[PDB]
């Protein structure tokens, strides 16, 4: 009975073990826990995530540092034929002598595990080459990632201001950012690819010495400032190239010309740079849009205020959405989350069909454990997005200060909102599930015919108005000619966005009734997932069963029995409940690519065709076909190719399952036998006097809804982790 | 039994010599 944990107080002298856990998970909840002021808080998240950027460079440093002395590079830049790159040297005393067996991989000596991250085709893809020429990485990044901490402190120290009110501007900042930051952050990149990298790519080197003496051309920046740009794009590259060594090189930066190549897919050398350039006006033109003292531009209210498009004469306000998104900091961290969430997948769904790297897909592995760590996350976000915009409504938010006002009304006219959401799911439910059992009752029954199977019309459609010059077909005004574009032609859509069907890597894969289902079952996910998040959110405030559900809103998990019987009805436990469908969409979706890809590589595609139009088969050939390789890899007949993976994959099935306790157990039963099990010690010799300092208890009644989860999840996410890899690697594909 | 400030000493010392030479070895007898 002493005093400890240095921030909270109720927690601080709690005699049990909760003392501990609950310490290590209130830490990051600054807004309202003992130590806090709107001045403290802000800054107490500011020199926090200056403790950020900081940890991202001790990551990246080492990424470039288990690479430069071993982990092939003055290899894989001799020609990157699909045989086993390298991350770092695996070193565990538990290893048998089958240290010698693959695991120990060709070129390098002691065992290793190879880059499935992309890095290896972008530390390369912006030039960066020679193994005497290379061994920087940490050296910079780290003589960086320390500065990252220095402000941390410097700006933590009172004196040379850490700044307090100055944290609620906007205009100034974001009038700064989406110019200063992004724009010049682009530009400056536009800078680099072009002076040092494009030359390093098609052309030749750049010597650490000269930087003036090197000149993409003979007669310099020539005109350029002479508004005359055009004659960049003429004989830029070629195709009879031999990538990296000139000869069919040519040297005129920028283009949109030439296109694909059996020797590298990947966006052309230049284009990723006029682009990086090209956008870099717009944001700079964008930056400089709001005030910042001088007296031009804009005040970020007065163009909301009575702005409003369909408002005007439809009795529906717009009051200080600014001093509520600004006075909120949660609205903030969840318009932040999403955008990022929506774009984390736009990143990672565009990063295929348009990978921008020197050998990538036509690698087809790294390409398939990289769409998904960007599909996981991304899903993983979205949730958190939807989860800090059901905290705004409780800790912050202010009914008297927002009302008639369009954030309200959103609350007010809410019962419909979840319903016309739930009506989507229930429909999107049984209608996907008629089509997929029916499709599985009919096979098995002997009749492959009778199979219900809708073509994905409005899909392929989008693409016969693009480049999917698949087996002709007019379309009324288009035909495949007469009118083509007329207004467009030999500019713009040249060889590019002209991959067509390309059974290998055409960008667009040629869609049928197999895809008119998964595509309706990724749609039944973000819908259901969000009726619960929308709902979760749309009353962390309260409702009929719990009316006054607040002053704490979020995680108050549980309530007394009676009323009807009340439970996981905190907006957290709906978040809690949400995260299962974000873990079931972000699976149907990923699941899908791969089966597709797999088949669309070292073999067929008919496979996904008549064998994804049903369900059993999704389990049989895929799931059951294509694990093969891995599991007979501990085999009664010695450790073969993979062993990390399969043991992971059962580590995968345990961490999972062992979720369930947490999940079907519920503190009551646990605590009570610990009541009998803490009559032991006390009553047994050679283990008496011997005092705990924390009172044996069973986990909190929210805590274990988490832990089963934060458990359900790794298992699950650590199983596909090891599943796909452990089978996109073998193949066959 | 001079315990008067110690243990930090025996956890660099003892545990840098149950692990310094304890891992290293002049000619493997490998994993």
């Amino acid at each position: 009975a002493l005093r400890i944990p240095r921030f909270s107080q109720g927690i601080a002298q709690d005699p049990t073990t909760r003392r501990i856990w609950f310490g290590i998970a209130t830490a990051h909840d600054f807004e309202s826990h003992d130590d806090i002021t709107e001045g403290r808080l802000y800054q107490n998240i500011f020199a926090s995530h200056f403790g950020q950027l900081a940890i991202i460079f001790l990551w990246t440093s080492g990424n470039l540092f288990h690479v430069a002395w071993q982990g092939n590079f003055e290899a894989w830049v001799q020609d990157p034929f699909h045989v086993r790159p390298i991350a770092h040297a695996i070193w565990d005393p538990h290893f048998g002598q089958p240290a010698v067996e693959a695991f120990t991989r060709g070129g390098a000596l002691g065992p290793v595990n190879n880059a499935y991250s992309g890095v290896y085709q972008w530390w390369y893809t912006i030039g960066l080459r020679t193994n005497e020429d290379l061994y920087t990485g940490a050296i910079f990044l780290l003589f960086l990632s320390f500065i990252s901490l220095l402000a941390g402190w410097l700006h933590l120290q009172p004196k040379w201001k850490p700044s307090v009110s100055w944290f609620k501007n906007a205009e100034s900042r974001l009038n700064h950012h989406l110019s200063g930051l992004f724009g010049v952050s682009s530009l400056a990149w536009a800078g680099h690819l072009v002076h040092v990298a494009i030359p390093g790519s098609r052309g030749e080197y750049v010597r650490w010495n000269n930087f003036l003496d090197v000149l993409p051309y003979p007669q310099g920046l020539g005109p350029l400032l002479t508004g005359q740009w055009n004659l960049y794009a003429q004989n830029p590259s070629s195709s009879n190239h031999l990538f990296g060594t000139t000869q069919g090189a040519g040297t005129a930066i920028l283009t949109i010309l030439g296109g694909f190549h059996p020797q590298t897919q990947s966006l052309w050398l230049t284009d990723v740079a006029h682009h990086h350039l090209a956008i870099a006006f717009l944001f700079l033109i964008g930056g400089l849009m709001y005030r910042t003292n001088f007296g031009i531009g804009h005040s970020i209210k007065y163009i909301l205020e009575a702005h409003i498009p369909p408002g005007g004469r439809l009795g529906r306000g717009h009051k200080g959405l600014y001093d509520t998104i600004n006075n909120s900091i949660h609205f903030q961290l969840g318009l932040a989350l999403a955008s990022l969430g929506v774009i984390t997948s736009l990143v990672a769904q565009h990063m295929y069909s348009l990978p921008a790297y020197a050998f990538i897909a036509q690698d087809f592995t790294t390409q398939a454990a990289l769409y998904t760590h960007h599909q996981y996350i991304a899903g993983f976000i979205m949730t958190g997005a939807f989860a800090h915009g059901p905290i705004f409504f409780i800790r912050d938010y202010n009914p008297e200060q927002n009302a008639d006002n369009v954030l309200a009304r959103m609350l007010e006219h809410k019962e419909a909102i979840i319903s016309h959401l739930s009506w989507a799911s229930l429909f999107l439910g049984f209608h996907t599930l008629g089509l997929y059992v029916h499709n599985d009752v009919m096979l098995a029954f002997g009749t492959p015919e009778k199979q219900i199977l809708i073509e994905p019309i409005f899909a392929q459609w989008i693409q016969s108005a693009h480049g999917k010059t698949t087996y002709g077909f007019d379309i009324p005004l288009s035909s495949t000619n007469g009118p083509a574009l007329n207004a467009g032609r030999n500019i713009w859509l040249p060889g590019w966005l002209n991959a067509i069907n390309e059974n290998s890597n055409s960008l667009f894969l040629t869609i049928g009734p197999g895809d008119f289902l998964v595509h309706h079952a990724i749609a039944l996910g973000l819908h259901t997932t969000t009726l619960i998040l929308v709902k979760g959110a749309l009353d962390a405030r309260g409702s009929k069963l719990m009316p006054d559900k607040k002053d704490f809103g979020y995680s108050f998990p549980c309530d007394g029995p009676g009323r009807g019987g009340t439970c996981d009805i905190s907006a957290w436990d709906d978040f809690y409940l949400a995260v299962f469908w974000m873990l079931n969409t972000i699976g149907w979706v990923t699941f899908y690519w791969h089966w597709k890809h797999i088949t669309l590589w070292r073999g067929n595609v008919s496979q996904f065709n008549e064998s994804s139009t049903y369900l059993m088969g999704w389990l049989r050939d895929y799931l059951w076909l294509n694990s093969s390789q891995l599991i007979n890899g501990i085999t009664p007949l010695v450790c073969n190719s993979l062993s990390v993976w399969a043991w992971m994959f059962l580590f995968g099935h345990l961490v999972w399952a062992t979720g369930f306790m947490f999940l079907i157990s519920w503190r009551g039963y646990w605590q009570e036998l610990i009541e009998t099990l803490a009559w032991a010690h006390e009553r047994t010799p050679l283990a008496n006097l011997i005092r705990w300092r924390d009172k044996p208890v069973a986990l909190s009644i929210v805590q274990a809804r988490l832990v089963g989860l934060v458990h359900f999840s790794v298992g699950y996410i650590f199983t596909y982790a090891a599943f796909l890899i452990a089978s996109t690697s073998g193949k066959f594909g | 039994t001079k315990r008067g400030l110690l243990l930090k000493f025996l956890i660099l010392g003892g545990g840098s010599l149950l692990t310094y030479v304890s891992a290293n070895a002049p000619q493997d007898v490998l994993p």
Partner: peptide, 30 residues
């Protein structure tokens, strides 16, 4: 001497832990 770079798994994955499991038993007391 020949073949000897094995200390940055115990000092880390072993001894660094000793420190903090000891040390951080500062949560209990100091």
């Amino acid at each position: 001497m020949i073949n000897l770079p094995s200390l940055f798994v115990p000092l880390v994955g072993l001894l660094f832990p000793a420190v903090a499991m000891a040390s951080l038993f500062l949560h209990v007391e100091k």
